[PDB]
Each structure stands twice: as structure tokens, then as C-alpha cells.
Design a protein around this nucleic acid. Structure first.
Ligand code: ZN
Length: 803
DNA sequence: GTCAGGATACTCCTCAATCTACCGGAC
DNA sequence: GTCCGGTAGATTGAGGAGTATCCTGAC
């Protein structure tokens, strides 16, 4: 097949005849090219590249150019390869020695279609772009290293000051646009279409750039200009969904395909617009859109896959390739290799899914029979972006890591599983004998660093910074390893290296507090966010440095830090939550979703929803107004006066809240017998109208109960947030415990408490309830009497406890 | 014969969120 | 013998990014 691949090119017959003539010496010491490299040049570079590499072989290698055989093939195997090979020979000495470019950067420029043109254009414009527009050598090379690099370089030279000054486009965004093929066209299109897309279509400059920053930016932008109002008005898609499709490579093709297939996929195939857009918003969107359009029924009716599984497979780059591979290969992996269809889909639903699927098909027998891996381990490695690369690396490298360095197969698999597993595996092979000897790290510590996403980067960064962090700042090597042991370890390590002395000298944090923040997944993000927000939270909201660190030192620290700064005003001033309680929520992982969900339910919820949300999160007893006797009405007035609450709020059945006086509420609780009084020890009193006044069904989480007193007073309790003074009690936070403690504080000698819990009352209530009760008091605990138990030593019957 | 542009597929690195086990008193 | 409350380690999903191959049109 490779011979045909050459024969069908513009110089196919000539390249094959020339290659056979010169292969005798291309395989020699000067280059030592193998069969793939020899045909690769003939296929892509053609006859001129084949003759050029041979004829100039004595200058390309063994000369001050130091252009290795692999770099020669990379340059030769392009249209115009002969031209790039001569040009890199002429300019490489100058670009490196005079302009300071790394030989790898010059080769990266040479290894493109039109490499000669990019090489000469960089030689001319590099000092101009750097000195006139502030573009670093890395940015100019990034522009140059493309097909048509010359055109991207010249266009940036002309258009950067126009886009920056006329439209406010950041110079880095101009480079980002010119960082792919067609950079000239994307820049010109942005200049032409920004007035239209931002004014007529209502798109932001960031959205226009995001589209332009991909390959085919001109085509995606022009297509959005035409199709966005059609997709929005005819099919009910939001501008964000149209841009999201356009913001992937090949956006034009996905946009037109959605317009054509969306009404068919929804009406005939039963897919939602969100599923179609999700498929469309990728590279090769149109391919997989049409692929499901035709394979969806087949995979469902013949292969037994659900629409959700097929859409999931289609939602990754190259979705068509994973879809077609599953079509033909699923019955082989599940029958010849015995894999569960869910495992094959799990592999298929990845970037490069076709490659992981085909690799398992051919490689699973080797990893299991030769290297001793289980099918679950091989699938686990396969089900990741780049799974093919990790699988091949394990096959060849595992016995070297195990036999030469003493690692277990499980440690190799653990490294292999993560995205970039190939890179972490090779990096451990190189650095493991250095890290464990030059710095004295334990091999388990190096593996712990390696077994993370981006492990290669953390391994190299520890090798560089470990002897500096432990000396310039005095950190313990264990602290550096701990920082390195999370995804993105390089980023946390570099941030600590530069930022620790600032957080200590300016913000007053200890090195241990800086490490505690750094040792997370979002380490760099939490570290930099604390630097900016700590004095703002402390001065604006009265937080201590310890509270800011407590929020930062978790997963999602940046998100919790900003959310607390954002939501504290409304959470405390409007909803009556204590700032410490908002911090307590933020101190947990996922702090922001928790506070946003609390905000949403407290803002748009009904009186019943706000009562449950506030009581479960804040903690307070609730007194129901159904009993309107003078004795209980006076109890409420007396309890309030003793506390002097700062705010009083009335909550209407529809969820709206008004600021009220105490006198108004005291009248309402007497007249309104469909209401509940919430007495927050923080100094916040609510009156809720229009609630259920009952116990919701037990849903397997925080539950409810009611305490009924002799005089008819009914006190509602929730489980969960208990009394800090009794933390050491294993019944703390239970309805029976809150009832017994309520009776103690209120000198109640008799009460009965009812709760809904279909799993039974836990055994801890059987002795601790009497302890919490004051001497002489009796509490009757009544189960729902609709279930027995879900554990041992549970109470399914009414029991009385006396203090 | 090179060169510019577009579409498509694959691989590597960071960041949150969520999801399970641990781990702790005290009748 | 939780309806509790951290703690560290383990998936699960999503987005930005650098790397790679292929085709088509115009000279
Ligand atoms: Zn209990």
C-alpha cells in the first residue's frame, strides 16, 4: 500500500525510481533511513526531496549544521522539501548564532509546506516583529511554523497594529490567530467581520477570536455570519451554541451540517438539539454528525447501544472514526477478546478513540499474556486520550522499568493510565535513577509524581526546583513531592518557587500554609488567587488569613475563593447566613457549586424550599404557629427579646422576602396559623408562610422531625448540623439529640418527638438521649412505624428515655 | 513543482467537581 | 450500634493546546 501511496503522487513514478537508485546510500551511516522514512520522503516530498536528501546527505549530517537524520526526514517530507532542505542549510547557522533561535525551532519552521518561504521570512522579519511589536522569538516561531507560514508572518506584520488599535485586539490574540494554517485568512476575516459580528449578531470579541484561533477561521466566521440567525430563528439554538460549533476546527462544516441534519436527527432519530450541538462542537463535527445520522439506528438496532452511548462516542474529535470502528469492531472485541460493550464504548468515547480501539484489538493478547496485565488494566489505559501511545509504551517499556529499577507492573499501569502516560513512562525511565540518587527521593515518591496528568512535567520540574525549594525557602523534600503529586504539578511547583516569599513577607502566611494550598489539583490557581484576594476578603468581609487559606487549600480553591467574595453580600445581608458559615461551605471541595446552589434555592425557591435550605445549612429550631395559645406566643416573644436579633424577615408563600419589624411578626404569628417561626441563634428571625407543616418522605439524606410539647407547641428539627459543644457524641446532629438538648435548655420535663426514617433509629439514641435530657425529663421517640431497619441494633418501636 | 488554505484525527497537560473509603470521640 | 464531620486518594467530565496527515485549488 505504501508503494501506491507514492505512485499516485505528482512525481510518484519518478520518486520510486529515484528512491531505489539512492536507497543504497540513504540507508548508510550518513542517515541510516529505514523503509518508512525512505518512502515517507518519496510520498510527501516527492522525487525532488528524494534526490535532495541523497545528494546533500554529506552536508545535512556530519557538519556544523548538526541536522539529525530524523530532522532531515521531517524537513524533506513536505511539498517543496528540496527547497526547505537547501534553505535550512543556508540559514540555520545564522538563525541560531545571530538571532538566538534553538535548532529545534528552525527545523520546526523548515518542516512545513513552504518551509523555504517561512525560513526566509523569519530571517527578514524576526528582528522587526520582536523590536517593533513586542513579539518574542517563541511567538514569531509559532507563527512561522505553519503551512503558508510566510503569509501568516507578513500578515501579522501588517495587521497587528491595525487590529490592536482599531478593535482593541490584544497582540497575543493576533499571534494566537496566526498560530495555525490559514493565519493570513483568519486575521483578514476578523478585521472585516468584527464590525458585523459584534454589532449585528451580538457576539463578543472573545467569541470572534475564539473562532479565528482555530484552523479554517475565515470559513467558520463567514459561515456564522450567514447561518447564526437561521440556526437561532429556525431551530431555536442560542448564539452561544452557534459559536461553540464555530469555535472548533472546521467550524464551517459543522455549522452547515447541523442546519441540514438537526431537524432530521430530532424528528426521526429522537435526539435533542443539545445532543446534536454537542456532537457538532468538535473537530470533524460534520463527519460524526452525518456518521450518527446514518449509523445511529444500526448501532442501536444491531449492536444494542443506546442513543446516549452513540452520542457520547460522537462527541470527541474524530467522532466518525470511533463510530465506524465500533460498528465493525465491537462484535470482535466483545466476542474474541471478551470485553464488555460498556468497556468498548468507554474506549470509543475518547479523543483518538479509533486508535485505542484498534490497539486493544491487536495488542491485548500481548499485554495480558506476556506482561501480565488484566483486561481491566489494558482497558483502563486504553480509555484515555492518547491511549494507543500509553499502550505501546507499556508493551515495550514495562519490563525495563520493572527489571532495571524495581517498579511493579501496577505502578507502571498507574502511570500509563493517565493522559500523557507515554510521556510520564519515558520520563520516569530517564529521571528515576537521578531523582532517587542526586536528591535521595524514594522510588515510590517518584512514581507518585509520575502517576498524574502531566506527570512528565512534574517530574522534570522537581528535578530542577527540588534542590532550590529546599534551600532558598527551606522546604522539606516531602513537601515538594506532595506539591508535585497532583495534576499540573509543574504549575504549582513553579508558582511556589516564585510566590512563597511574597505570601510570607506581604500576606503574613507561613511556608506550611503556602504548601497546603499548593498541594492540590488547582494548585497554581489557588496560590495566585490567594495572593490577589486575601487582602480583599480580609478587609472587605472580615475574614482571617486562616479562613482564606482554609478556602484555598482544597480542590477548586480558586472557585471557592471568588465565589465567597462574590456571594457573601447577599448570603449574609439578604438571607441572614453567618459569614463563618459561608466560609465553612467554601472550605469544602466544590465550594462554589455548593454556594451557588444555596443561592439559587434561597433566591428563586418557595417558602417551603427556603425553609428547608436555610434550616439544613444554618441550623436552628423552627416553631410552628398552628398553636396560637398565649403561652406559646409569649414564649416566642421572650426568646427573641433574650437574643436581640439584628434582622427580622417575612417570607411569603411565593418565596419573596420583606424586611419587617418584630412587632409586625408578633402579630402575624398569632393570626396566621399556617406559618413557621425560624429562630436563628446568629440573630436572624424568619417567619415562613404557606409551608407544608409536615414531615417530607424519607429520601435517604438529611431528614426532619417534630417535637410536640404538653402545651401543644411543635418544634421542627433537621438532622445534620449539630451542636459544636457536643461534637464528641456520636448522636450529635440527630433529631432525638436536638430534641433532648432543646428540652434541656428550655427546662421541658416531657415531650414526644416524631421523625421520618425508614432505616430505623440508630442505636446511639438508646443511651445518649437520656444523657442529653435534664434530670427528671422524659422524651418519647416515635418512629414512622412503616419500616424495621437497615442496620443492626436499630429501634423500630416507640421508646421512652428518662434523664 | 511549490505553496497557501481548509478539514480532520490524535496526543498531552491543567483545572474542578464529584465520589467513594478512612478516622475520629463516647453510652 | 448515624440521620455526623473532616481527610486523602480516586474517577469523571470539560476545555485549552501542540502535533500530524491529507486533500484541493492556483499557479
Ligand atoms: Zn441518633
Amino acid at each position: 500500500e505504501a508503494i501506491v501511496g507514492v505512485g499516485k503522487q505528482w512525481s510518484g513514478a519518478r520518486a520510486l525510481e529515484a528512491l531505489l537508485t539512492v536507497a543504497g546510500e540513504l540507508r548508510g551511516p550518513p542517515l541510516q533511513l529505514d523503509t518508512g522514512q525512505l518512502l515517507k520522503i518519496a510520498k510527501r516530498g516527492g522525487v525532488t526531496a528524494v534526490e535532495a536528501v541523497h545528494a546533500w546527505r554529506n552536508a545535512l549530517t556530519g557538519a556544523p549544521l548538526n541536522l539529525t537524520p530524523e530532522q532531515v526526514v521531517a524537513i524533506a517530507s513536505h511539498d517543496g522539501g528540496k527547497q526547505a532542505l537547501e534553505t535550512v542549510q543556508r540559514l540555520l547557522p545564522v538563525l541560531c548564532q545571530a538571532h538566538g533561535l534553538t535548532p529545534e525551532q528552525v527545523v520546526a519552521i523548515a518542516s512545513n509546506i513552504g518551509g523555504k518561504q517561512a525560513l526566509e521570512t523569519v530571517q527578514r522579519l524576526l528582528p522587526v516583529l520582536c523590536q517593533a511589536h513586542g513579539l518574542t522569538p517563541e511567538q514569531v516561531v509559532a507563527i512561522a511554523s505553519n503551512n503558508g507560514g510566510k503569509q501568516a508572518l507578513e500578515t501579522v506584520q501588517r495587521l497587528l497594529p491595525v487590529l490592536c488599535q482599531a478593535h482593541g485586539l490584544t497582540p497575543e490574540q493576533v499571534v494566537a490567530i496566526a498560530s495555525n494554517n490559514g493565519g493570513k485568512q483568519a486575521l483578514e476575516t476578523v478585521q472585516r467581520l468584527l464590525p458585523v459580528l459584534c454589532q449585528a449578531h451580538g457576539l463578543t470579541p472573545e467569541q470572534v477570536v475564539a473562532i479565528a484561533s482555530n484552523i479554517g477561521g475565515k470559513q467558520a466566521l463567514e459561515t456564522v455570519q450567514r447561518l447564526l440567525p437561521v440556526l437561532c430563528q429556525a431551530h431555536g439554538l442560542t448564539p452561544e451554541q452557534v459559536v461553540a460549533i464555530a469555535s472548533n476546527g472546521g467550524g464551517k462544516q459543522a455549522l452547515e451540517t447541523v442546519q441540514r441534519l438537526l431537524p432530521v436527527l430530532c424528528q426521526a432519530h429522537g435526539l435533542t438539539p443539545e445532543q446534536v450541538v454537542a456532537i457538532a462542537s468538535n473537530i470533524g463535527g460534520k463527519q460524526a454528525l452525518e456518521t450518527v445520522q446514518r449509523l445511529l439506528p444500526v448501532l442501536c438496532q444491531a449492536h444494542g447501544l443506546t442513543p446516549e452511548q452513540v452520542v457520547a462516542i460522537a462527541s470527541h474529535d474524530g467522532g466518525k472514526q470511533a463510530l465506524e470502528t465500533v460498528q465493525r469492531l465491537l462484535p470482535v472485541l466483545c466476542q474474541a477478546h471478551g470485553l464488555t460493550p460498556e468497556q468498548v464504548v468507554a474506549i470509543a468515547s475518547n479523543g483518538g478513540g479509533k486508535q485505542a480501539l484498534e490497539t486493544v484489538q491487536r495488542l491485548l493478547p500481548v499485554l495480558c499474556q506476556a506482561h501480565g496485565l488484566t483486561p481491566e488494566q489494558v482497558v483502563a489505559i486504553a480509555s484515555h486520550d492518547g491511549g494507543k501511545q500509553a499502550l505501546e509504551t507499556v508493551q515495550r517499556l514495562l519490563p525495563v522499568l520493572c527489571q532495571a529499577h524495581g517498579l511493579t507492573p501496577e505502578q507502571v499501569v498507574a502511570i500509563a493510565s493517565h493522559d500523557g502516560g507515554k510521556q510520564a513512562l519515558e520520563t520516569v525511565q530517564r529521571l528515576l535513577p537521578v531523582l532517587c540518587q542526586a536528591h535521595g527521593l524514594t522510588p515510590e515518591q517518584v512514581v507518585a509524581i509520575a502517576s498524574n496528568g502531566g506527570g512528565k512535567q512534574a517530574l522534570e520540574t522537581v528535578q530542577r526546583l527540588l534542590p532550590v525549594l529546599c534551600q532558598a525557602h527551606g522546604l522539606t523534600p516531602e513537601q515538594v513531592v506532595a506539591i508535585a503529586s497532583h495534576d499540573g504539578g509543574k504549575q504549582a511547583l513553579e508558582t511556589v518557587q516564585r510566590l512563597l516569599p511574597v505570601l510570607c513577607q506581604a500576606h503574613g502566611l507561613t511556608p506550611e500554609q503556602v504548601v497546603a494550598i499548593a498541594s492540590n489539583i488547582g494548585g497554581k490557581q489557588a496560590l495566585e488567587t490567594v495572593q490577589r484576594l486575601l487582602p480583599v476578603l480580609c478587609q472587605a468581609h472580615g475574614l482571617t488569613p486562616e479562613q482564606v487559606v482554609a478556602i484555598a487549600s482544597n480542590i477548586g480553591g480558586k472557585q471557592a475563593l471568588e465565589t465567597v467574595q462574590r456571594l457573601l453580600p447577599v448570603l449574609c445581608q439578604a438571607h441572614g447566613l453567618t459569614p463563618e458559615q459561608v466560609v465553612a461551605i467554601a472550605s469544602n471541595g466544590g465550594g462554589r457549586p455548593a454556594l451557588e446552589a444555596l443561592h439559587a434555592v434561597l433566591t428563586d425557591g418557595s417558602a417551603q424550599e427556603r425553609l428547608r435550605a436555610l434550616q439544613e445549612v444554618a441550623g436552628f429550631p423552627v416553631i410552628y404557629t398552628e398553636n396560637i395559645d398565649e403561652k406559646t406566643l409569649e414564649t416566642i416573644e421572650k426568646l427573641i427579646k433574650k437574643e436581640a436579633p439584628g434582622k427580622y424577615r417575612l417570607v411569603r408563600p411565593d418565596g419573596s422576602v420583606e424586611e419587617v419589624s418584630l412587632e409586625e411578626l408578633l402579630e402575624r404569628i398569632k393570626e396566621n396559623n399556617s406559618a413557621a417561626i425560624a429562630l436563628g441563634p446568629s440573630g436572624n428571625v424568619w417567619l415562613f408562610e404557606g409551608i407544608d407543616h409536615s414531615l417530607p418522605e424519607y429520601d435517604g439524606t438529611t431528614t426532619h422531625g417534630v417535637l410536640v410539647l404538653d402545651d401543644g407547641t411543635q418544634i421542627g428539627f433537621t438532622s445534620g448540623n449539630g451542636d459544636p459543644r457536643y461534637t464528641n457524641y456520636r448522636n450529635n446532629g440527630h433529631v432525638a439529640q436536638k430534641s433532648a438538648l432543646y428540652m434541656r435548655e428550655n427546662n421541658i420535663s416531657n415531650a414526644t418527638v416524631y421523625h421520618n426514617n425508614t432505616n430505623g433509629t440508630c442505636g446511639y439514641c438508646n443511651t445518649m438521649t437520656a444523657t442529653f435530657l435534664p434530670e427528671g425529663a422524659t422524651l418519647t421517640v416515635v418512629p414512622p412505624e412503616n419500616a424495621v431497619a437497615n442496620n443492626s441494633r436499630a429501634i423500630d418501636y416507640v421508646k421512652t428515655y428518662t434523664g
